[PDB]
Design a protein around this ligand. Structure first.
Ligand SMILES: Cc1cc2nc3c(=O)[nH]c(=O)nc-3n(C[C@H](O)[C@H](O)[C@H](O)COP(=O)(O)OP(=O)(O)OC[C@H]3O[C@@H](n4cnc5c(N)ncnc54)[C@H](O)[C@@H]3O)c2cc1C
Ligand SMILES: Cc1cc2nc3c(=O)[nH]c(=O)nc-3n(C[C@H](O)[C@H](O)[C@H](O)COP(=O)(O)OP(=O)(O)OC[C@H]3O[C@@H](n4cnc5c(N)ncnc54)[C@H](O)[C@@H]3O)c2cc1C
Lengths: 479, 482, 482, 482
């Protein structure tokens, strides 16, 4: 078995394969630099209920994704125990918090933040999850700007966070302990013929043979498989959801006892603080879907993240020392849903397109793919997210056009801007036409989700034309 | 018969006038004051029948504040039958006194957490303690409002049976009801109260005339103490009343709509606040600023107009931005120097006062009127109003420490309510550097008396000569009573 | 008759009234209009004798704009003797028409570089071209001003002999001078101009009366075209005039001080602008907003009041913030649909128009009055005003492309003048998304006519029915003239 | 020995190293310091060859400030031939030390008028006094810039022959030139200077070794006084040097473009400033914050990063907003406690110092190097450096009153540079309430010494124990020198 990719998904599937099939040789590809790596740029939150939006839970596909997140949360305590078991005290602790506080402030669009707060409360009650709405005065540690302060707060019990760096180290160590081998090169090409995988050409010119190849190369995953015959229009594209986060040494070495977060905001950015050991906090995280990868933060991303954290969470962060600006690529599927499971090529598997919550879902996703590889049926709810598929249409064009204008306006309210009171209504009216024109031009059948539609709107004419051709080639393949 | 003169033609003068005229067929009652109602609080009022909406943590932390609150809750019970009795003297064409039955209190972040969050909690507690009908409601369920999202409320409280009146229709109904009961309106001002052998003789008017009386009731708003202070000893025995200058506006809404309820915040920096009071005929009332001034002012500052308009358009309804301004209104809330009203009798036989009611004299008017009329008839009026007798040593309802904490918090709230945008370290620095100057002023003014925050800020920014005159006043009061 | 009726009692009606009365003592001249001056531009004006201060790059880029500018410079020469002749009919106690001799133009960054920087350069160029006395001065040398440092000017231009008048004292002096010259004031409105056999017979008034005349001069401000449009054919032969609704204010300064000069910016988004005009007696005039409205409006919006006050307090003097608001004033600048005035004769014998002067009819008034009186006497009046004859095809002074560039720039300027605070990518995005809708509207309205930016924005945000009626109007004009 | 040890591998150490090596080929010169250059000012510098751009009204108001300015002007004359001599030891492929020949100073309103307007005037005066080539230019003529219109400059000044260097390429050229002249690089730190019988013996290094020398030149940046203060008496005879922590950034521009000139403002609140220094290969340098810290700091605060980025994106080029952040750089400007450099000889024979150069040691480096080498050869070096001898009583370059005016003005400037948005009365209130606490601190610290504003603000917000330690330090210095 060859696992292509050394993020949370590759290493998690690597560990599960190595541990459950001691009869098989498992090799994991990827380099210590983890170029464009989502996992090392993550806090990370074990986000299930915190990831709930009204828009997600309005669609059948969104409700399915949410069910999987709730299932994954149950696996984390024993998964962490099993990974820490391979180490010693000096390796540090994977878990950094047990609980999450969701804050509601007015530094955002009512149409996102108010709707999403209501949706989180409903989803918690529906799941019989332990939680309570608490007085904001009872939230320890926070020191917001009064004009940026929360007026409601929600305590979620047993929804916590991990140190993504300590998790990656624990996964690598656990992989080696179970007889896995780490080969620090990248796959250049998957070799297959007579409808079956033969192995992987690496970027040092070598060839590694295999009966099974599992592609978990984050935002590079579809580009790798798309080289095989037909698969260019049978595996949904995955783009770079470029995310900026930061490590901050707090002014007094303090940190909150819980995750602090807002609900998901304009184009799947959001504000959160994840506790870390040793007088550090993680703050995150911006999001921008990019049609080509980017490995450096924009000035705008850094200013936005810092401004939100200092005003809405703790003014003490303003005088705190910046240790690191981190950048990683959320694997952003073109149809808005993950690519998990088997392929029309025997022995070829994919684990990708997980966007904001692959790290959280990792133990569940790993166990699902390993079950499938062993001739099992894995987890009942994952079939719709099979990687070889027509593009999913989870929303009407009308729903998406309402969403993209609302998210565009939310980039103003989240800044937060100060404008003449008539300007927002004028901007809303003048945004509708151009987005409706773009959606109608791209395809008669497919509509990109808002996060991708905004990226396409502001891309070059040539990039838009190439996407029109892609959508036409997909329609031809499947209809 | 034995003549009564009421000095003042606001809500308190006219309300006592109506009650005397109706209950005392033995008395001829003459009410003084001009149609212009110079510096008049009542015509500038929305007005809210504010009892629970007027609750602050700071008010209910003092015994005097809790006593004042009990009286406001009692007054609310009198309004339905009072309005019936006033409308009875008119016809349909005179219009309706009541403009709303219910109030929604909104909590947004365009203000200081130390005022708005504390006060929202205090209002909820006071409602529950009183067993008053109310509920916390979803903000999405508040009809009509269309705030700027960055200025929007995240909590809302529905108060059942706490409503509003049209202050103009109330004044017209009071005047008409006064005349119907045999009262006479004499449109001149009192210049001087005449007394000798410890009894009132009557009033010199500003047309040079003298009107004799056995009883003089002073309800001249912010002018009330200045009028009586001319009589022997009374300069240091009747607490001073200053002008709580308030700006409000009448707006013709873009579509002729209005909310079904009062919309308000809790009381904000130095007893300003944001509210919308429904009116008939496609008008809304928006209010209201507050600034304690050591001398009267009858025109709005540019700052007051911009602040009121900016708050209403952002926090209540952006539609008000394109709405037509009909009138900017200015009136003087009678602001007592010791923070409590001046209600009842005097050391001068036949001399009575009804004043120093600040934000809620109009709401309390039927109760206050019935109290003073009962006292004039040899009754005991309303239990609990004895503490607010007009001839008194200055009340000390708070420690100097409580007031110094309050004045710094209210100063900072003028920033958060703007709302300002500043470097994140600036507020803490300003807070630290405000404490010393206010502590120095409080210590300099008097060893015994501390002005409430609303007055202390006015004194801080007044001329050296005005501060020195107040030091002398406080010293003369201490000498009189100790 | 040989009787003359002037319809309208603003600066243009009264100025032409005075000139007719003085030069034809043999004829009866009657001037119509009421003391209320409903929607009156003149009483809402400061007013600046604005010639060089009114220069914009956009105006001087067109032949028609350069012609209008030449006339403004000519008008300035008439003011000293005009004022002498008007004050001559009064006494010392009537007060002085002139309130300042000089103007300082300030350049700050509370606005669009594409308007304010371009316009500052255009004013400097026009002054140098005219050999007019002026100096660029250090901002530190501008007396009186006390701006917010973040709103302060960094350049200042002293214009010698470009001053201001008190519009109220001017109107009083014109009425008095009209009577002195044998004019009669009849305080009613014209309802109808009566004509037949291609000649005026007189005016029906709103009291039901009929006044006969050989000459009718229409100077009814924004009502002028609506009045004449009732006569056969004239609906599509006299360019429409709309209401350029303008808000200004009178402020009593905190210390009774004022600047010795006019203080102004260049003309800003959609022909608004910021200025302070000195007044006597501790008052200043601040102005002035502009919004072209397809129907008249006589009350300020909240938005207009907040914008004017915010600009004046930040950019001119923070002392205005604590100053007392005396009056909010609203008047209608007569806004011609083709961007140029309507001055002179008609196809109806004895029917004359003096209107559509927008921002600078008051400044041009002595020149315009003398021009129309010369024409009435069979003269040729002033060279260069023939192009602005009232009975005309709509002028096309700019390409559709120039106007579309202008309307997007002016739209963006409403943001920068606020001033807004936005993410740095938002303005470019808004600019890109504004171009298409304005291009679509311009193409839809007419194949030949394009409204100037100030009108195009009003049409963009008007009702579908109002847009359709304008499409029909433009089509009927094209049919009449082509 | 006749051996020379240079302690420090910044611009000053390497520059003096090169000059010694080149002029004394007979002697062994060893330079200490590690490639990491911990807290190093030089590698965090753009850097501007700032002479006229560094002019402030406040600097040129003092005799010591005028002396410092004269030296900066003298240094600028040396740069062309100094660069020629350093590039001569390399080839084209080493890159070019010079990145721009000219500087444009921009004046915008994102700052305090009391700093930015005064400083712009002071720069213009200093250029004219020096007969320096310069022109005030139209802002529209400044190439490349694309500011937010609300943040845009309205004046611009072109300074000819005041340019910038790549600090990294300069350090590489200095190291290469040092080796070419026979210098030896020993990559360890000095721990201790050894001296007895009033003469240097050499240096103990942090690897435990001892290097003998007849001459030790201390150029260890902000660590320089701490190193020499260990010798007898010198703790209170060598003025303390603190860390002027400065944050800068390298940005890859969206299109690989950059300006042809340095772009800068004048020096702003507490010796921060905004500038962009061109670099090769599609990079720009932006700088630079300043904070005097009583202990060294090697990481940027969030506040420093946000402020730098916000100023550059608004005031210089909005294109930087979408540009990629390559590196946040932090270095320590050596901040002398008395505000002036420590340059020259000591009471210890063979012991020299080159430090406390704050914002402009890099610029002054060729002049400072030549000065110390002249002194070591028994010369008098450069006229006017005598006041800045390292062994001295603390300089008192300003009255306590001047410094107290300055510290309040600089405090207020941190608001205007943000830029904040606050109620118009708040700034005057803050100014009044800042004066007392700073006056109290100045009076408490010492009866004779007053820290300059940049240090006084750091002391104001430091711990009580840190303030008390400074009171003791000042008392020990007074005792030593009086
Ligand atoms: C700023 C940020 C914040 C986040 N916060 C959270 C959070 O709070 N909670 C959460 O659950 N998740 C979070 N995530 C992550 C999210 O869950 C992702 O979907 C998840 O990390 C995806 O993991 P992955 O292993 O699929 O991809 P990655 O983590 O990107 O791993 C892919 C790896 O494969 C390597 N690779 C690429 N090409 C090749 C090749 N040809 N051969 C070999 N190796 C290759 C890459 O270099 C990389 O190291 C966050 C991500 C970002 C960017
Ligand atoms: C902006 C604003 C908003 C308000 N909103 C509310 C509200 O929502 N709810 C509420 O309950 N109350 C409100 N109030 C009013 C508050 O309750 C006042 O305390 C109350 O109106 C005081 O009434 P009064 O009759 O004592 O005084 P006033 O209403 O001031 O009446 C005094 C009258 O006496 C006249 N007078 C003065 N001197 C003489 C003289 N020498 N001789 C004769 N006549 C004289 C004055 O001209 C005046 O007309 C508001 C007031 C203001 C200013």
């Amino acid at each position: 078995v060859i696992v292509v990719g050394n993020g949370v998904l590759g290493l998690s599937v690597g560990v599960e394969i190595a541990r459950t099939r001691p009869d098989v040789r498992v090799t994991l590809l990827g380099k210590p630099a983890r170029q464009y790596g989502a996992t090392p740029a993550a806090g990370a939150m074990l986000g299930a209920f915190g990831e709930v939006t009204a828009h997600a839970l309005a669609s059948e596909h969104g409700r399915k994704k949410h069910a999987l997140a709730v299932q994954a949360q149950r696996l984390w305590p024993e998964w962490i125990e099993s990974l820490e078991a391979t180490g010693t005290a000096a390796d540090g602790r994977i878990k950094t918090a047990d609980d999450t506080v969701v804050l509601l402030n007015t530094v955002g669009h009512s149409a996102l933040d108010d709707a999403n707060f209501a949706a989180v409360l409903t989803a918690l009650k529906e799941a019989n999850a332990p939680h309570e709405e608490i007085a904001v005065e009872s939230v320890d540690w926070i020191d917001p700007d009064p004009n940026s302060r929360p007026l409601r707060a929600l305590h979620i019990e047993g929804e916590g966070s991990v140190d993504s760096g300590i998790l990656l180290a624990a996964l690598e160590r656990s992989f080696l302990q179970a007889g896995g081998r780490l080969h620090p090169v990248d796959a250049t090409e998957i070799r297959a013929s007579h409808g079956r995988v033969e192995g992987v050409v690496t970027d040092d010119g070598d060839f590694l043979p295999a009966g099974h190849v599992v592609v978990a190369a984050g935002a590079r995953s579809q580009r790798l498989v798309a080289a095989l015959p037909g698969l260019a229009h049978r595996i949904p594209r995955i783009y770079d959801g470029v995310g900026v986060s930061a490590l901050v040494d707090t002014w007094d070495g303090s940190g909150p006892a819980t995750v602090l977060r807002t609900s998901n905001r304009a184009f799947a950015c959001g504000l959160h603080l994840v506790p870390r050991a040793g007088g550090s906090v993680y703050i995150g995280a911006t999001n921008a879907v990019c049609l080509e990868p980017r490995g450096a933060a924009s000035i705008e991303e850094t200013v936005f993240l810092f401004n939100c954290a200092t005003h809405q969470l703790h003014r003490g962060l303003n005088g705190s020392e910046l240790r690191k600006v981190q950048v990683g690529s959320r694997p952003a599927p073109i149809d808005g849903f993950p690519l998990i499971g088997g392929t029309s090529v025997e022995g070829l598997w994919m684990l990708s397109g997980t966007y904001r919550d692959g790290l959280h879902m990792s133990p569940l996703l790993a166990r699902h793919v390993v079950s499938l590889m062993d001739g099992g049926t894995g987890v009942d709810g994952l079939r719709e997210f099979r990687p070889e598929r027509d593009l999913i249409s989870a929303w009407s064009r009308e729903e998406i056009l309402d969403d993209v204008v609302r998210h565009t306006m939310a980039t103003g309210y989240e800044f937060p801007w100060r404008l003449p009171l008539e300007w927002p209504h004028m901007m809303e009216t003048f945004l509708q036409g151009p987005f409706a024109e773009l959606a109608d031009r791209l395809s008669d059948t497919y509509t990109p989700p808002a996060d991708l539609m905004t990226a396409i709107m502001f891309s070059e004419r040539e990039q838009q034309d190439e996407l029109i051709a892609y959508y036409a080639d997909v329609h031809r393949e499947w209809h």
